């Protein structure tokens, strides 16, 4: 009976939410993480189950070499004409005057797939959304990039009509339907036909603490015909600096079977170090942009308003007609690698898990060492989101390196310039050793150096653990699985947060992950064998 | 009779030079420019002709998404066992603690191809070189990357033996043969068997003004057996700060049929702005790393020495047995696009010229607008090196944009963050206009803005010209090909120089190019038609 | 018999060297260190004694608030008309388009003083030098600052004539006598009348590794009449990157009684960390700019040349008529504070040692805690130069702090943003403790924090020691003077080097010092008592 926000914890950004009959679906952005577009299902809005990602082949999504926080930006899921339509955007540039992107369309009769070979739709801007008019016409509504430095870069909301026989746009039909408000950065447009009006929802202010969603309406789809909601915005936490939820905005409106109204929003829970002002910095989002759900009611003038005020609520009444959905009690994961395919919570960087990266099955994960976590190409790594502030993760691994260019173990990663791990490697004095390293915006630290821990001569497998405790984390190791030693360094979790990455890079749209990887930049394909992976969430 | 250095002007870096009978060949690094590996041929060392590049397919070279100054680093061309062997390196990371690279091998019975499908050899380090021992054994000798921040990053010269039946390395044979001198950054290793000794040539000091080449020798290929040449180095311009040639070092030794000896080196001719100290900065290399050739003699103790002293000479005596080679008088280019394939002097960024980029033939180049010059993906651009300090380039282009996201014209480019051009685009008030823009490390300037030049309603084609004058350059346009207007903006050529890019980016290994491109980041594939391209070199 | 360079080790920059009869004098720049202008005397050029500094009162020198590496730049000492003339410069701005300076004149009949109340001469530029023409006319010759960013900042060598009755300049006589060479940054001018010519010595290239001295001559003092020495420069180590001496240039020529010729130059001995290329960075000068002396001979065309070539020599033949001079064997210092005035080797920051800073005598130094080493105002600190690569320094101090804002101990300091120390302070949990801190360009580290060492309840005095070992240094403490504990942190000496400070600040002209200080930024004037100071130089 009670939605507890965030409902989708950890990296679950840019929710597109729809209802088909009694079933709700949310699609989230995935950026450089493969497979592309995360899908979840529910019948109550409270409990959610992970579905297979649509963009699961290189025919659907080719992101080798993509910059971090390029790839899949906000997706748009829709249902019309007896099928699912997915608009998705592959962004190739994350900084500077340009943001070159391609918007694609795929479809499916079943939410689990298979998905049709993608059609390229256009560029123009990101946050592309398929509007299905009740009269059978279809349109793309999107953000509009402007590279001209003497203008504002978000040049209104473009609406362009499809030829529905080919699903190619007719570019001559393009127009700006809405310029937004003085907060600018107008994006994330969605159109809805409600009570004889077209309602436009749009995100503004950028996806940090000044984020908001605004609402406009028009009787038509004419150029600059949309009028802004009075007493706006619809949702923001800009002016609620102490609230548990922050950065709400970009999202999607859905009805229930009974005619209630809900809004899924991206959201963050940024925390502070003990010595910081709570209001500067407002905090660090290690769990990145998650998804919340807010209830909506309509005021007497026909404008939608968030229940509990424009900041939303932590706890929200579930739909009256909610059908109870069974879901795991938390996001803990206990993987024996018993199955021939990866658990759905695992993701790879940019590319599918192929035989080149390794194999899973019969109780073992094998990763073939290729490029380091610093590469945008051919990284043999699997990882899953941080979905709690406190957790323990553990593995048991065997690796036989003969050079220092071979490394394998347990990692925490944000991107190619923000990661850490504890790993087995080789050194000239001791042979097989354990080291811990952190890459902090290419300031790279090896903690143990010459004092790397010697792996005793009888030792086959090494056990590794990371203990994440909100603001900080540690690595531990064991030669028997029972007696553990802590490596005496406390790592700052803020290094793996959106708010930290934003300081020196314009792509900061994911969240921290934990996982397993092997590297061999000697190019000799050294194999690491992992017997299990455990991720155990702890109370907050 | 007289070699005039640089013999290969403009971007012609990292020369690997061999002799087969009476013919000399030089292979140069190409980085992100496609096709990969530049080849030149001569029988006199004075005059050189361009041959087809070996790495001309995505089976041989796949660099989509590569960072600028990644891709093809120093290549190694060798002839043994009646065929050509090419070792080449695709570098995927240009900054930070790692430099993930793969070394590949292809072979050919004819220097013009075809080349065999590549074998992956290893990583370990760049500057990989195939040593063919007279006894039939074969080895890879290379630089050795060390990511450990508490060590020096260039960890000696690794030698590893091949299994010659499969041409796969036997990693257990790896050893460090040479640690270099205190100047460090030891790389560019080549081994030669001469007069009963193995001679090792290696580059040191990095490829900027502290570059040098050193020589070592051993009776064996044993671990750390190589002894440094006394009274070194072999070549450097570090300590000749006023000399016309700079940055000499990384290169290759060849004999002539009569037993003379020559050394090809990379080289630069960096210039100064008027107000700068000649010694700080030492200058700006718009023509990048070019190739020089120096004569070598052997001293009484059996050590090789450059004729004219360790700084080399501008003019060098050609081989006594030189066979005259005819070559074009300069590198001017007059292209009517009359042929169905591109002139060899044209390159693309990262990827082959496919139908997706456009077409050439019957007097026209068609470029299909795709991503901007800011992208590492799908850029419809062809360009050729700056090969003189002073030149005029000109084209005639037709383009019908309906949005400001469509741009086409005449460009000067170093990389995705360092380029300029004059182009046709569209604006809201005037329609078809001419603009000039410069991207200076993502500081992007539109020069004309609202004062972009209106293209008159009669106008089919627009003519564009760039005049490069060493330190600075301008753009001009014409609506009839006879009456020209100069855009009143003088651009700094130093923005397209290795030495400028080095200030904020660790990949700075190419050189300035001039060419033609079309962009359509609206994604509507707008086509630009170019009737010709002219590149006219002028005296220094 | 043998000058061993550097003859004046540690910070002894910008030597002005003259001879009066059989006695040589060198004056050196002192920047923010008080008293101003360092003076040394010798009769052999091999052994040197420190004399009292001229600028010993606030009437002569007022530097409170001066930026680090402002204050006293290159001085000029001359002897004519039976007295010493000192031109000195107080620089108030060290970065940006301006470098506002005032040049002053003081005189003395005795080198040890007293010195006359200073006359303000002009601004115009630094490196002002008094030229006494044989014909009785007198001139100021100087560098010429140009703030205009579209010009080169060093606008030739200005010569302006004095009215010798008032020793005020006649501005109308100003002209540029010499523009220098393409190396630019022309400064440090000195004029000499020799063999019917005016010879001009000038420094160029800036005071780092591209430093050089050039020589020009003219029959007149006419505008742009000076012609450059062929086959220059006169002195440089730019092109001797492995030589023990570096950065030679700015200096002064003197004759001996017998007609021999010597040149005193500033010089450095920059060292490398073990992992660095010897040529980039060329190294770290913890001992700053020291003084060397080179021998000069005249070629057949009447041009001066350094004996041993333009790089100079480490060891140089002393004058034939040299009179062996008694001097301390090294710069060790054993100070019991038995005297009522400070040993001459001690300096203060910016201001005289007044009763406000404390007192000395009867076996004790008392420092009254005022502002921290981070301040340009009222710092109770005395310090002496690092003058060897390896040394031990030690003190015994009593201090009774009641707040953490009170700190006193043994410091190593370069400037307000580059220092370290071990000190007594107070903390909330333990009371009197020992801490170590480093300020590294305002990245401030407290090493022990909560684990600061508790000072036992009976302890009156604490003993402190620093052991400097070229590239690195440590701190030790003792509660009895016999049993020592090392604080387990190795500090990088490069943080207190010119070459490090230059990376982020345009004033980098001094050198590392070691000394004693007390701070009380609670403003309660807490007094630290030091019983002795020992500085013991060790072999290289």
Author numbering:
A (entry chain D), B (entry chain A), C (entry chain C): 1 to 540
Could you pull the original sentences from the published paper?
The β‐d‐xylosidase LbXyn43B from Levilactobacillus brevis DSM1269 is a glycoside hydrolase, predicted to be involved in the intracellular degradation of xylooligosaccharides (XOS) into xylose. The crystal structure of the β‐1,4‐xylosidase from Levilactobacillus brevis DSM1269 has been solved at 1.9 Å resolution, revealing a two‐domain enzyme composed of a catalytic domain with a 5‐fold β‐propeller fold, typical in the family GH43, connected to a C‐terminal β‐sandwich domain. The enzyme, featuring a 5‐fold β‐propeller fold typical of GH43, prefers short XOS substrates, notably β‐1,4‐xylobiose and β‐1,4‐xylotriose, aligning with its role in hydrolyzing internalized XOS. The previously shown ability of L. brevis DSM1269 to utilize xylobiose and xylotriose as carbon sources for growth, combined with the current data, leads us to propose that LbXyn43B is the enzyme responsible for the first step in the intracellular metabolism of xylooligosaccharides in L. brevis DSM1269.
LbXyn43B crystallized in a tetrameric form, in accordance with the size estimated by SEC and OMNISEC on the native enzyme (above) and with the oligomeric state reported for most xylosidases from GH43, subfamily 11.
